[PDB]
Paper text:
The P pilus, produced in uropathogenic Escherichia coli, displays the adhesin PapG responsible for targeting the bacterium to the kidney epithelium. The PapA rod is formed by more than 1,000 PapA molecules assembled in a right-handed helical manner, with 3.3 molecules per turn.
In order to investigate the PapD/PapA and PapA/PapA interactions within the P pilus rod, the first structure which we solved was that of PapD/PapA, where two mutations were introduced in the papA gene. Thus, in addition to the G15N mutation, a mutant where residues 2 to 8 were deleted was next constructed. This mutant (PapANtd1_G15N) did not undergo spontaneous polymerization, and formed a stable complex with PapD. Crystals of PapD/PapANtd1_G15N diffracted to a resolution of 2.6 Å, and the structure was solved by molecular replacement using the PapD/PapK structure as a search model. This structure is very similar to the already known PapD/PapK, PapD/PapENtd, or PapD/PapHNtd1 structures. Like PapK, PapE, or PapH, PapA lacks strand G of its Ig-fold; PapD complements this by donating its G1 strand.
Residue numbers in the entry:
A (entry chain B): 8 to 163
B (entry chain A): 1 to 216
Write the structure that this text describes.
């Protein structure tokens, strides 16, 4: 059945993602509390997601494709009242914002933009930055932080 | 890192269970894989009638593994003359990062799981979608699905090429149901759907009046 069954009929597969790093992470490096505390935003880190095993002619399509057979969407703990701010661990007071095709990514499940596919390749290009959380009394404190976002692909 | 083997799953009701192959495409680190079922409204279902086992498992680098899909006795309550809709979920849990200030991405794959009762068991390359009917309506078409299965329509156009590459909002018709779509009048309609294998065939219609059916 499907993968244990064998014959001429090709069965297309869902995508498998991977990044430059083995743990599927992006390192922001040490950040200045003072800078963040003053409204500063870290230098944008590239968040590239490689799509393998699947026909990319569905993510903004490869060489075209206007239809949408796969829905893309990010999910993660948000900042109270700000669905576009991925909350963080460690209590540092920081938050994370990811930008797609010029527009911010929302982490409440709403359909994302399956239009970030780098024309010509099989990579979704996003950018991420760290900033003082936009929550009342945030206060950027020092220390290490981390966050996990769910990249959801739903197939029709 | 974790991935599934198909974009949709058909559960043959004449059987008590089936397996889905999963894989850790990462060659450096282990990843956890969670699997679970959702009902037709995408609500998590824990006690049946369809169960995914194991709910969570560890996959060493490059490891291949499987998730079993099985049913409880109550699966018999579902209608036996039409498909029922479920969703299969596969979410990975990446290992904790070695680095300090970091953001990790975790993939989650969600596909359709069709419960196909024994009474409507299908042949290896049987085609029922050619049973679809098109009804001209003001501003478009009413797509009729008189079959006992779920049909996913991904294209409607005046030519085979347009059905395949033309802008179209994918719509899935439940068994014995219909849906209206905005569209231009085509004297020769072509429709494209997704079959059990993830293939995307194209049907050619011949209209007579405001009714259109696939040509023999």
């Amino acid at each position: 059945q499907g993968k244990v069954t064998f014959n001429n009929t090709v069965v297309d597969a869902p995508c498998s993602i991977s990044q430059k790093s083995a743990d599927q992470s992006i390192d922001f490096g040490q950040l200045s509390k003072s800078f963040l505390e003053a409204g500063g935003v870290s230098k944008p880190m590239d968040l590239d997601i490689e799509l393998v095993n699947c026909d990319i002619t569905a993510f903004k399509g490869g060489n075209g494709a206007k239809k949408g057979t796969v829905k893309l969407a990010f999910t993660g703990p948000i900042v109270n009242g700000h669905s576009d701010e991925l909350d963080t661990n460690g209590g540092t007071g920081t938050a994370i914002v990811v930008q797609g095709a010029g527009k911010n990514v929302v982490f409440d499940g709403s359909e994302g933009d399956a239009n970030t596919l780098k024309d010509g390749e099989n990579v979704l290009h996003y950018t991420a930055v760290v900033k003082k959380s936009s929550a009342v009394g945030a206060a950027v404190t020092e220390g290490a932080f981390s966050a996990v976002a769910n990249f959801n692909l739903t197939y029709q | 890192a974790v991935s599934l083997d198909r974009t949709r799953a058909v559960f043959d009701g004449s059987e008590k269970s089936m397996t889905l192959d999963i894989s850790n495409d990462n060659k450096q680190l282990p990843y956890l894989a969670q699997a679970w079922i959702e009902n037709e409204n995408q609500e998590k279902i824990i006690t049946g009638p369809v169960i995914a086992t194991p709910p969570v498992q560890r996959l060493e680098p490059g490891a291949k593994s499987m998730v079993r899909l099985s049913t409880t006795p109550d699966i018999s309550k579902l209608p036996q003359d039409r498909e029922s809709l479920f969703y299969f979920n596969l979410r990975e849990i990446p290992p904790r990062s070695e680095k300090a200030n970091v953001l990790q991405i975790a993939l989650q794959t969600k596909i359709k799981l069709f419960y196909r009762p024994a009474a409507i068991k299908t042949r290896p390359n049987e085609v029922w979608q050619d049973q679809l009917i098109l009804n001209k309506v003001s501003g478009g078409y009413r797509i009729e699905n008189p079959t006992p299965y779920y049909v996913t329509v991904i294209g409607l156009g005046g030519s085979e090429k347009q059905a395949e590459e033309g802008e179209f909002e994918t719509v899935m018709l439940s068994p014995r149901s219909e849906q209206t779509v905005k569209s231009a009048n085509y004297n020769t309609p072509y429709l494209s759907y997704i079959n059990d294998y993830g293939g995307r065939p194209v049907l050619s219609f011949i209209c007579n009046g405001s009714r259109c059916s696939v040509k023999k």
